[PDB]
From Swiss-Prot, chain B:
Changing R39T: In strain: Omicron/BQ.1.1, Omicron/XBB.1.5, Omicron/EG.5.1. Changing G32D: In strain: Omicron/BA.1, Omicron/BA.2, Omicron/BA.2.12.1, Omicron/BA.4, Omicron/BA.5, Omicron/BQ.1.1. The chain holds residues 308 to 356 of 1273 of the full protein. Changing N36Q: Reduced viral infectivity. Residues 12-28 are annotated as: Disordered. It comes from Severe acute respiratory syndrome coronavirus 2. This is Spike protein S1. Attaches the virion to the cell membrane by interacting with host receptor, initiating the infection. The major receptor is host ACE2. When S2/S2' has been cleaved, binding to the receptor triggers direct fusion at the cell membrane. When S2/S2' has not been cleaved, binding to the receptor results in internalization of the virus by endocytosis using host TFRC and GRM2 and leading to fusion of the virion membrane with the host endosomal membrane. Alternatively, may use NRP1/NRP2 and integrin as entry receptors. Binds to host ACE2. RBD also interacts with the N-linked glycan on 'Asn-90' of ACE2. Cleavage of S generates a polybasic C-terminal sequence on S1 that binds to host Neuropilin-1 (NRP1) and Neuropilin-2 (NRP2) receptors. Interacts with host integrin alpha-5/beta-1 (ITGA5:ITGB1) and with ACE2 in complex with integrin alpha-5/beta-1 (ITGA5:ITGB1). May interact via cytoplasmic c-terminus with M protein. May interact (via N-terminus) with host bilirubin and biliverdin, thereby preventing antibody binding to the SARS-CoV-2 spike NTD via an allosteric mechanism.
Length: 49, 49
């Protein structure tokens, strides 16, 4: 640097670059009682308890 | 209920009959004598069968 010395570009360029971004994580749905209870009779009642 | 989509419950299809299976054997296990053996072992040296 100096108080009277500028720099100037003469030739230029283009540099196409990528910018990846997430949008949607895999929309998952978990059954409330199918996972927890193996579709039984007493366990399901104990769950809704 | 307004317009839209709603997951009411699950769809656990019921079974249509029962099936039980086992080892193709007819032997009994000698229990009654063990429970009524007049000749019985001691405790500090118990017998395993």
């Amino acid at each position: 640097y100096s108080n009277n010395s500028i720099a100037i570009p003469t030739n230029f360029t283009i540099s196409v670059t990528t910018e990846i971004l997430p949008v949607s994580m895999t929309k998952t749905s978990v059954d409330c009682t199918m996972y927890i209870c193996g579709d039984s009779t007493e366990c399901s009642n104990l769950l809704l308890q | 209920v307004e317009k839209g989509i709603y997951q009411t419950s699950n769809f656990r299809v019921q079974p249509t009959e029962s099936i039980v299976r086992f080892p193709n054997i007819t032997n009994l296990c000698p229990f009654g004598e063990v429970f009524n053996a007049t000749r019985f072992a001691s405790v500090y040296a118990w017998n395993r069968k």
